[PDB]
From a paper:
Rab27a is a small GTPase belonging to the large family of Ras-related in brain (Rab) proteins. Rab27a is part of the secretory pathway involved in the transport of melanosomes and the secretion of vesicles containing insulin, histamine, chemokines, matrix metalloproteases (MMPs) and exosomes. In humans, Rab27a is overexpressed in multiple types of cancer, including breast, lung, pancreatic and liver cancers. Evidence supporting the role of human Rab27a (hRab27a) in multiple cancer types suggests that the inhibition of this GTPase could be a target for cancer therapy.
We therefore generated hRab27a mutants that were capable of crystallizing in the absence of effectors and were suitable for ligand-binding studies. Point mutations in hRab27a were made based on the crystal packing of mouse Rab3, the highest identity hRab27a homologue with known structure. This led to a construct, referred to as hRab27aMut, that is able to form crystals that diffract to a maximum resolution of 2.82 Å and with the potential ligand-binding sites exposed. Inspection of the X-ray data showed that these crystals were highly anisotropic, the native Patterson function indicated strong translational non­crystallographic symmetry (tNCS) and a high copy number was predicted per asymmetric unit. The diffraction anisotropy of the hRab27aMut crystals was estimated with the ANO mode of Phaser to be 207.3 Å2. To avoid these potential problems, the systematically weakest reflections with the largest relative errors were omitted from the molecular-replacement calculations. Most residues in all 16 molecules were modelled, apart from flexible residues at the N-terminus of the construct. Residues with poor side-chain density (930 out of a total of 2736 in the model) were truncated at the Cβ atom. The final refinement used a pruned data set from which reflections conveying less than 0.05 bits of information (24% of the data set) were removed. In the Rab27a structure, the SF4 pocket, formed by the α3–β5 loop (a highly variable region among Ras superfamily members) and the C-terminal region of the α5 helix, is of particular interest, as it is fundamental to the interaction of Rab27a with the WF motif of Slp2a.
Numbering used by the authors:
A (entry chain D), B (entry chain C), C (entry chain A), D (entry chain B): 8 to 178
The structure:
């Protein structure tokens, strides 16, 4: 009931800003383009249970992440993000979901897709339906998040917790 | 009938621009000198068959590529490029073809050499015969490509597909 | 009686400046933000014995340190530092002490926490009690060090030497 | 009778300029501070034999070199350089020779120490005797080299060839 999952996606998505909105309920706009392999942890109570939630952050400038073979290997669920203000990030989601399924333990591992930076209404480039459709072909939940607003952040992470808690219970 | 091969060579050759000309039939002149380990995938029909072609790109600033021991190890053919406007790139091809043969699975693995940036007629430095000769000593196909024009791009990749499809069939 | 330990913590703490104050008894204010994996060595006489002390320095821009699986794996004690003039460094100590216990050999390995840059009285941000309290919850020694002054440097390293010498003797 | 050795030392020593003086008998003053893991090869005739000499270059900004566990592991001799115009480089030689002996195959592996940049007479900082003394305590050959002049370059590499050829013959 230590629960570990991994946040991943492209550089600029906002997976550092997103974990901090959840862990600490506020928004640091300052963030070095991550070089290392950090994590924030925090105790949650969901289904009247003990959850030491361990939120592992990754460097956006590699898919060598999930080649960690311990950090990725030890993780139980994945939180794939993209930026709703660059298409490139969104288009890679297929390649991400793909490489997860292959290099992961289970054939179908527990994933939640977030389209971040939703507050940037004026720079939106990914259309919501197309996103929802991509969520359909894979049958994984989708949330339009903002680490600036907090919109759907808690929902999104709580879903991933609920998914793997189900997986844990099914066993 | 998922087919994986790896594009490699020196930094500036144009192996990112070349995969995008093939995948998407156009030319992005913008490309950050690759830091990560990306790939584009795409479904092709060659010999009335299902081809999920997986085009793996590498960072030009290492031969630590092919030390990937999974990414290189899992790949079935190699697409070695050089720039026809710097000799250094061309001269390394021997050292590349060399280190492939050694660190690869088969004694003779399936390779296609491309001399890229052929549109840069005014800055050409490698002479075509010398290139063809180098292709001779190793008995691997050679194409003078441009990611700007698309010239010989499709031909070149289709050849590499045809080679490993032959290898697959021979087994 | 070659003794190896590893200095680690965040970028800017002063673990390069601290090893040099100890090895060489003076202060180089010049220090490139470490890119490699250096060490200083030096022969010491503690409990009337031969000590080839090997002081391994790490790059502050990773927890991929302690994933070294030889450099970290071969080390016998750890010297965790933080800067008393940025809270972030101090707050990570928990996450450091945590990840050490997990990825290390022994359940409880030999650690000494240093709060560096104590000379920067005017920019002090971590309160001494809170630091001492953090040392309490884990039961590991704590020193307020300066690589500029030398204050508590020798004490701190000599303690870590004494701890693992005890561990060696107990075996 | 493929012979592999590895050139290593600190960033700025001149181990890229030195291999090129040997391979090609001239001096490129232009050299990006190496990021990757290159090698030059060349066929030599020493003791009336076939030598495919493989000269592996390393990035100066790590001792993670010799952690390559294939590139270092596959190498048969080592060519340690330092700059005669910075003491730091020279002082590390002990730590280099040390870490070689430990992480290498044989207890005493085949090493040749070069003090490079000897042409920079006006900026010389390491005194020749002190260098020769350091060579004495370890009993490995020493040459004062210049990649600018070619002075002692061929001698130095030919010695390392002769050493490991002896080791090969003794077996
Ligand atoms: N306005 C706004 N900016 C955001 C949002 N999420 C992230 N950012 C901003 O996007 C930039 C990078 O986000 P960051 O938190 O570094 O994301 P990351 O995906 O962890 N970066 P990397 O992949 O390089 O490690 C910063 O400028 C950050 O403030 C968001 O929802 N809204
Ligand atoms: N004119 C022209 N420019 C080209 C061609 N191919 C690549 N380029 C240009 O060459 C530069 C580098 O191309 P790029 O694809 O990044 O090369 P790379 O070898 O993939 N780089 P890296 O190894 O770092 O991944 C870019 O400015 C790109 O437009 C070509 O056929 N013609
Ligand atoms: N005033 C003061 N400056 C210090 C002290 N210790 C380190 N510094 C300064 O802190 C800066 C970085 O210190 P350094 O030793 O390089 O830090 P590091 O923890 O080794 N960094 P990295 O993790 O990037 O290798 C340098 O400017 C150095 O002078 C100290 O005790 N007092
Ligand atoms: N005058 C002079 N300059 C030299 C000599 N050897 C190398 N240099 C110069 O020193 C600089 C760096 O040398 P280089 O060969 O790149 O060394 P390196 O050790 O491979 N560097 P890295 O560790 O970053 O890979 C360049 O300006 C090069 O021209 C020499 O004998 N004399
Ligand atoms: Mg980040
Ligand atoms: Mg590229
Ligand atoms: Mg440092
Ligand atoms: Mg170099």
């Amino acid at each position: 009931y230590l629960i570990k999952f991994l946040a991943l996606g492209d550089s600029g998505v906002g997976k550092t800003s997103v974990l901090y909105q959840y862990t600490d309920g506020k928004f640091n706009s300052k963030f070095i383009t991550t070089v290392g392999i950090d994590f924030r942890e925090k105790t949650i109570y969901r289904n009247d249970k003990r959850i030491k939630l361990q939120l592992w952050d990754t460097a956006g400038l590699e898919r060598f992440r999930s080649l960690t073979t311990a950090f990725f290997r030890d993780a139980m669920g994945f939180l794939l993000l993209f930026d709703l203000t660059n298409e490139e990030s969104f288009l890679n989601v297929r390649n991400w979901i793909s490489q997860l399924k292959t290099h992961a333990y289970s054939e179908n591992p527990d994933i939640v897709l977030c389209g971040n930076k939703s507050d940037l209404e004026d720079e939106r480039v990914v259309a919501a339906a197309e996103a929802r459709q991509l969520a359909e072909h894979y049958g994984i939940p989708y949330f339009e998040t903002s680490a600036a607003n907090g919109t759907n952040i808690s929902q999104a992470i709580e879903m991933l917790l609920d998914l793997i808690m189900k997986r844990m219970e099914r066993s």
